[PDB]
């Protein structure tokens, strides 16, 4: 059986008719994560500290499931202005990723978010027990 | 090997090149399901209900696996108007999952989808 | 644990911050696809030969794994204009799946997508070894 996600003091803590994530056997399912402050729920201002927030929540959801970064099977970035976040998104995973091995990902403009935020993600981990 | 899921009285009829989903090892793919009448193909009238036949759909073509609605450990939900319809997805999974527990979701908005409809589940189960 | 594919004679070439895609356990995840021409980059001209070639190298891709078309979990397939663009994909999807069977998928509009390009894939895959 699939086991939810519990939250935990590093991590989100869902308000509404959801959870982080699940580990499913060997995969982790990370639930859409947004630049919001763990804390206060509320988006967290500049660009680029928006987006490195983003993924830092979604990381945090995925390390208390046990996965790591270099677990990462699937990112689906949601963005508002691909024309305008690509090179930060990009800037961003150069700072977490470093030189890589990089994950399988899609960058995709979308209308309107979780919240009117500018950028939202979808990960999905490999990480064998 | 997947298992391509085969159609059923309880479920949705495959119309054109794409099959339900699929069961892979332990775990089940739901292709994209609209809130439409498996026996007419016409989407069902009125937002609360449209928004509940689409899960119903997917929760059904999940069955047809052996995936309960307790299986689910992706939702991607499309819908047409995030800040209307959102409340109305929201409201339709307090239904079916109680208090808890609740899966992982991602909601977004889209500027359409197949037949100009307003909402669209990806459903991901684990068995 | 998880195994990025190499790019390949038959294969994209990433060049940016990700990769063609990756195998974890029994199943393959391909990143983005677009129907660019493998050795150069550029965008290949004419709708159909365009969506045939954003198939063709998801499945390039899939292969550099061990996967084949009968191996797909899940299309997801992000398109510029569903009207315009539903029925090539689907002659695509004729032209290689033959009667079938067919794979689970979604096919969704989308205001932009990187480089301006009118469709992308997103290819999940299960192919035990």
């Given at each position: 059986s699939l086991k939810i996600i519990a939250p935990t003091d590093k991590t989100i803590t869902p308000?509404?008719?959801?959870?982080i994530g699940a580990r499913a056997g060997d995969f982790v399912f990370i639930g859409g994560m947004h630049?919001?402050?763990?804390?206060?729920?509320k988006m967290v201002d500049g660009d680029e500290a928006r987006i490195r927030r983003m993924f830092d929540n979604m990381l945090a959801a995925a390390e208390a499931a046990?996965?790591?970064?270099?677990?990462?099977v699937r990112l689906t970035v949601f963005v508002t202005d691909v024309a305008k976040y690509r090179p930060v998104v990009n800037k961003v995973q150069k700072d977490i990723?470093?030189?890589?091995?990089?994950p399988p990902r899609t960058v995709l403009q979308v209308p309107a978010l979780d919240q009117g935020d500018i950028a939202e993600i979808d990960g999905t981990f490999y990480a064998p027990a």
């Open positions: 308000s509404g008719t959801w959870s630049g919001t402050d763990r804390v206060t729920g046990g996965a790591t970064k270099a677990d990462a990723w470093g030189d890589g091995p990089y």
